[PDB]
Curated annotation (Swiss-Prot):
Residues shown, of full length: 4 to 131 of 671
Superkingdom of source: Bacteria
Entry's localization field: Cytoplasm
Main function: Involved in the transmission of sensory signals from the chemoreceptors to the flagellar motors. CheA is autophosphorylated; it can transfer its phosphate group to either CheB or CheY.
Gene: cheA
Record protein name field: Chemotaxis protein CheA
């Protein structure tokens, strides 16, 4: 029954992933427009909550780690650069694959999950 609420989430998520991608591509690393970063962070926060609500473990954890990083960057605690933005784009790419698996009642890719989470946690570490 709870699956009766997946379709709306899947559509919202796809749209938010597209927005995330465009904002990422338009970001100026050394001087990121505050309003643009806030939008990326909000898309991630939204996707994370939906993932939690429906028990999409892999997507939730992946988005969780990205969100914390986007929070650091938007609060100005973390400096951005082209490498970080490329990591965010790669993260958006992987999240889309995870979502596409759920749409098919399939399980996301375990290896891609471990790789992206490892990279995101490495960056946070480096940020500290």
């Amino acid at each position: 029954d709870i699956s009766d609420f997946y379709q709306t989430f899947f559509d919202e998520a796809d749209e938010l992933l597209a927005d995330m991608e465009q904002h990422l591509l338009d970001l100026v690393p050394e001087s990121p427009d505050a309003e643009q970063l806030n939008a990326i962070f909000r898309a991630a926060h939204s996707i994370k909550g939906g993932a939690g609500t429906f028990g999409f473990t892999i997507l939730q954890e992946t988005t969780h780690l990205m969100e914390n990083l986007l929070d650091e960057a938007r609060r100005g605690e973390m400096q951005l650069n082209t490498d970080i933005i490329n990591l965010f784009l790669e993260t958006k790419d992987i999240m889309q694959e995870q979502l596409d698996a759920y749409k098919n009642s399939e399980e996301p890719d375990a290896a891609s999950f471990e790789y992206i989470c490892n990279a995101l946690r490495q960056l946070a570490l480096e940020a500290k």
